[PDB]
Design a protein around this ligand. Sequence first.
Ligand SMILES: [Mg+2]
Ligand SMILES: [Mg+2]
Ligand SMILES: [Mg+2]
Ligand SMILES: [Mg+2]
Lengths: 113, 115, 115, 113
Amino acid sequence: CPLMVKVLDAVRGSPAINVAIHVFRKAADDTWEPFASGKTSESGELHGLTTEEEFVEGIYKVEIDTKSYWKALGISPFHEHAEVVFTANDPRRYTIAALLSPYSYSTTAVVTN
Amino acid sequence: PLMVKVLDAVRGSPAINVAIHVFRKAADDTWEPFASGKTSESGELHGLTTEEEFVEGIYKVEIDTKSYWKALGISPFHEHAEVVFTANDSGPRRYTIAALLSPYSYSTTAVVTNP
Amino acid sequence: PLMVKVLDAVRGSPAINVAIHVFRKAADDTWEPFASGKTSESGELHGLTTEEEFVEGIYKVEIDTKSYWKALGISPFHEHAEVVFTANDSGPRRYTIAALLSPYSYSTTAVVTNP
Amino acid sequence: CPLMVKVLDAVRGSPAINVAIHVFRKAADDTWEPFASGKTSESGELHGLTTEEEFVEGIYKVEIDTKSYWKALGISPFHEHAEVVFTANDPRRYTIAALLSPYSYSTTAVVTN
Ligand SMILES: [Mg+2]
Ligand SMILES: [Mg+2]
Ligand SMILES: [Mg+2]
Ligand SMILES: [Mg+2]
């Protein structure tokens, strides 16, 4: 799979498990079309979102439902979600990593061949 | 009530001349333009709104990081950094949205204080 | 010439009353005490040193994050956050050391400006 | 192995390869005794630093030679290194992750069972 998402919890020092992830692809009329989705695993990872044949160049948005995650832990969060928006560019594998705190997050792209 | 501060993690400096657009979610669920501006030489953007106009709502702060890096000769990963949050739902607050930029990474933090 | 700013990423607030110790590497390669203080209600620590006393050297800023979290009922991962850097080796500069704290994570950024 | 170190490069969006890592354990006289060391792999990871039998409770310091890494890339860095200091506490595995930029770094502990 050319696109993987990994989420960590900076409060508990753990993978962020059961986080909902939605991927969108920008359409020609500038709307966001649903592309793929899932929930992070026990390791905080979401694999299998797409395939080399499907993941063509274009602008993609990855929406990480951080609010529901913090709500399930009983911790008041700031953001509605974390969104990562990027242009896929032709070999490359994309790992979108996110590090979550209730009032802060960071995201990093690890792009490898 | 709403300030944006942007730092450059490659140079260890404010990120100057960064375009910032703020949107507010409308009743029909679309993003309406709310305010815009660009960071100063200190990397801050002040004066976007007022206590009266900054009512409860869901707000989106779009920071044009890609143009910033491209003007410095770098092709970055992200199209922009987007910060989406509910504001003032417990009464008016002061919000500082901070962003720390690298070509393939950014972080964003909110500092929320009660006037 | 040297300021330290500390933010709490759990609460979205300045990190208040954080103890900070600064050390400078001596000629015998040991860490000598240089200055200390604690963050204010704004999460900043000003006045640690002066342009005259802040000579070239290798400096270490130790931020006592563990005591901060423990006083809030949290058992954090790190003993402290340590920021080590060469200062003023191209002439005097102004340094802001920023730290962003979570129980199992922190980040630190330097903003360096030329007077 | 109970202790793993992973390093990412936020400028290139890649693992940080060939980064020197030194681990120290605090001695009874408060000095730092060398404990283990190595260099990150092509995946930015350093495995095999210690064993369950050796990695007893105590205070450990992980020193990541960020300066030499940035110098080899030709980019002027701020820090001499990144140090992560923590008390190991009894099952647990420790992953020390670091995200490097020339004037900033973050470190996170992912502690799992
Ligand atoms: Mg092309
Ligand atoms: Mg209401
Ligand atoms: Mg000299
Ligand atoms: Mg015990």
